[PDB]
Amino acid sequence: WGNGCGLFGKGSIDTCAKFACSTKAIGRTILKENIKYEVAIFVHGPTTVE
Amino acid sequence: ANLAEVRSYCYLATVSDLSTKAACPTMGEAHNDKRADPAFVCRQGVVDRG
After folding, report:
1. How far is the alpha carbon of A29 from chain B, nearest alpha carbon, in Å?
2. Which residue of B has its CA nearest to A32?
3. Does A47 touch chain B if contact means CB atoms closer than 8 Å?
4. B47 to chain A, closest Cα gap in Å
5. Buried-most residue among A8, A27, B36, B40 (CB within 10 A)?
6. Min distance A28 CA to chain B CA atoms (Å)
7. How far apart (Å, rounded) are the C-alpha atoms in residues B29 and B22?
8. Which three-class secondary structure string do you get for B4-33?
9. Cβ distance A12 to A5 under 8 Å?
10. Strands in A1-50 per DSSP E
């Protein structure tokens, strides 16, 4: 009665809130011929600080 | 001289339509479009392949 209902006791309730995303802590995979390396060789021949 | 229902267990039929969203290894999980509406019941698994 207190709040509009005819009998006294437990009444059902099913509420809902919305959902979309903001900051996605994304993550991915690394499949193991596309691997190329870049090596640089120097020679301690004549030089200057420059 | 006014009852009310409470629950309803079923014995069932409709187990006719099918779906199988495939995902290759390392390509992650598989999301079946039939997951937007209770139109169907989905469950994931994995298959040995290549």
Report:
1. 7
2. B26
3. no
4. 18
5. B40
6. 9
7. 9
8. CCCCCCCCCCCCCCCCCCCCCCCCCCCCCH
9. no
10. none
**Which amino acid is it at A23?**
T
CA distance B22 to B44: 10
Q: Give the integer Cα–Cα distance in Å for A36 and A40.
A: 13
Give the rounded distance of the alpha carbon of B34 from its chain centre. Answer: 8
Cβ <8 Å between A31 and B26? yes
- For this entry, resolution in Å reads 13.7
On chain B, the residues whose CB falls within 8 A of the CB of A29 are: 26, 28
Q: Name the method of structure determination.
A: cryo-EM
